[PDB]
Amino acid sequence: CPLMVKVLDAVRGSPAINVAVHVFRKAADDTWEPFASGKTSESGELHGLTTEEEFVEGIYKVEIDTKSYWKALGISPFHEHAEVVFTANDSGRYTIAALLSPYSYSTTAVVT
Amino acid sequence: CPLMVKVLDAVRGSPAINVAVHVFRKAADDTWEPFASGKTSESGELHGLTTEEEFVEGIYKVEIDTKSYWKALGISPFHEHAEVVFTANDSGPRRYTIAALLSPYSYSTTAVVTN
Amino acid sequence: CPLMVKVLDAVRGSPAINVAVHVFRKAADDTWEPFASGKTSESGELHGLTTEEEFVEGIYKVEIDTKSYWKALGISPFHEHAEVVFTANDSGPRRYTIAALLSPYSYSTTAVVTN
Amino acid sequence: CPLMVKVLDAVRGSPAINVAVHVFRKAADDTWEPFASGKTSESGELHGLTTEEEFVEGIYKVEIDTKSYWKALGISPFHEHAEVVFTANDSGRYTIAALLSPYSYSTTAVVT
Numbered sequence: 001c002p003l004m005v006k007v008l009d010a011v012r013g014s015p016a017i018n019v020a021v022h023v024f025r026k027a028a029d030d031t032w033e034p035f036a037s038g039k040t041s042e043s044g045e046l047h048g049l050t051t052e053e054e055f056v057e058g059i060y061k062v063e064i065d066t067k068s069y070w071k072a073l074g075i076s077p078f079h080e081h082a083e084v085v086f087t088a089n090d091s092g093r094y095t096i097a098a099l100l101s102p103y104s105y106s107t108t109a110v111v112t
Numbered sequence: 113c114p115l116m117v118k119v120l121d122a123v124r125g126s127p128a129i130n131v132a133v134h135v136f137r138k139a140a141d142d143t144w145e146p147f148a149s150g151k152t153s154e155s156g157e158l159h160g161l162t163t164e165e166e167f168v169e170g171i172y173k174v175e176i177d178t179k180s181y182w183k184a185l186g187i188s189p190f191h192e193h194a195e196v197v198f199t200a201n202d203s204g205p206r207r208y209t210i211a212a213l214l215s216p217y218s219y220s221t222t223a224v225v226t227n
Numbered sequence: 228c229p230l231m232v233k234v235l236d237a238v239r240g241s242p243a244i245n246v247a248v249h250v251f252r253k254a255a256d257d258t259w260e261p262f263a264s265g266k267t268s269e270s271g272e273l274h275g276l277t278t279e280e281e282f283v284e285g286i287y288k289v290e291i292d293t294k295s296y297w298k299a300l301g302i303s304p305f306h307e308h309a310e311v312v313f314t315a316n317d318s319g320p321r322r323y324t325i326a327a328l329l330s331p332y333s334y335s336t337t338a339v340v341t342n
Numbered sequence: 343c344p345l346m347v348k349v350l351d352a353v354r355g356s357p358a359i360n361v362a363v364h365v366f367r368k369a370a371d372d373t374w375e376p377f378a379s380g381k382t383s384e385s386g387e388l389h390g391l392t393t394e395e396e397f398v399e400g401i402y403k404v405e406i407d408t409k410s411y412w413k414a415l416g417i418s419p420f421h422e423h424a425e426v427v428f429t430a431n432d433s434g435r436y437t438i439a440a441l442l443s444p445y446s447y448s449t450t451a452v453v454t
């Protein structure tokens with residue numbers, strides 16, 4: 001797995017389960033084209049987005065539907081979603097992690 | 113101001129100065145329209161983006177140009193930028209502070225909304 | 228002030244008001260000695276903890292009573308408190324801002340140090 | 343494993359390796375007594391601190407030597423260490439995660 005996403009809930013201290021995640025890659029006309037998508041597991045993880053074959057150098061956007069997550073819990077959150085945008089410069093594994101709260105989120109990249 | 117942006121640097125323990133910020137508003141033809149832009153001050157703050165009159169209900173995107181910030185300090189960070197997307201003023205006028213704390217491979221954002 | 232503390236609430240999108248804060252200084256008999264304490268204001272800030280004269284070089288511990296904060300809002304959080312321990316003024320006098328962003332099972336802290 | 347610690351480096355986007363971690367449990371005279379310790383692995387993880395037998399209800403302190411980590415990298419950091427203090431109320435697995443930067447850290451508890 002060259003690309004994994006992991007989502008945590010900072011309020012309840014749990015994985016954030018069943019969170020929709022959409023991945024886009026930048027096209028040569030500077031528009032976003034769908035690339036991969038999924039829902040986080042019981043462990044708050046999403047694997048199997050891509051193969052190494054398909055995950056070439058490029059600019060990618062990882063969109064996490066945080067709003068639906070919080071609304072399902074009876075909480076009116078601040079953000080519409082959380083978006084993580086990065087170049088994969090693949091030269092010399094990417095884990096995109098997000099930690100969520102209703103009015104706040106943090107994200108880090110672990111690249112190994 | 114009804115909309116303020118504050119940016120801190122987690123590596124240097126400092127305000128993040130001269131960070132470019134672009135604000136867009138969703139135009140319901142569903143494209144992002146330019147709304148306001150500016151650069152953070154020596155205190156890492158950006159005020160004067162808009163007036164209460166102009167800051168109507170809508171979905172807004174605050175784009176913080178983190179990459180140009182780290183690169184200007186001569187290094188190569190992970191993210192292209194940090195974006196914060198939210199609905200504003202949908203239960204009437206509020207004051208919004210969008211805060212960001214930056215590291216080369218990580219950032220945090222939070223909103224302070226007062227009435 | 229040479230030492231200020233600011234606390235935000237990530238669940239409510241608000242300053243964290245009336246949070247108790249205790250500051251201690253290591254006494255080199257190696258016990259923590261009381262230094263200053265206070266409660267955050269309606270803006271989530273705490274000033275007036277010390278003077279430049281009294282804030283000498285040393286190792287300081289800033290203890291933020293997060294548990295009493297969440298419990299006062301009627302819930303049961305994970306941490307007992309959030310502590311921030313640092314050496315101060317060891318390359319001469321600086322101004323320190325200790326900031327914390329709080330959730331029931333998580334917190335973040337950062338320092339802004341200016342000259 | 344009832345207690346795991348995981349440490350990440352927010353600057354470099356990597357696990358924080360070889361970081362010393364000391365765990366204390368509160369004694370009945372309101373003093374801290376050593377409980378468990380270790381160094382993070384190549385994956386930035388520390389397991390095998392405790393058994394379920396030994397990990398009874400109590401107040402625990404997890405101390406992460408962040409200062410040595412940053413100094414070894416040629417960076418003068420702000421904090422002496424990062425301390426995480428919590429009651430384990432074990433009634434109905436604890437993962438203590440920390441994300442580090444020279445002047446900042448975040449910590450979250452994932453309790454499953």
Ligand SMILES: O=C(O)c1cc(-c2ccc(Cl)cc2Cl)ccc1O
Nearest residue numbers: 008097098099106107108439441448
């Ligand atoms: O902001 C983050 O994505 C973050 C992520 C963290 C993790 C650490 C370790 C693991 Cl396995 C997963 C996650 Cl989401 C810890 C703290 C954080 O602030």
Ligand SMILES: O=C(O)c1cc(-c2ccc(Cl)cc2Cl)ccc1O
Nearest residue numbers: 118211212213220221222326328335
């Ligand atoms: O996540 C943030 O953007 C953040 C923002 C913080 C602030 C607190 C107070 C002020 Cl005035 C400004 C900022 Cl950026 C403190 C900690 C944080 O983690």
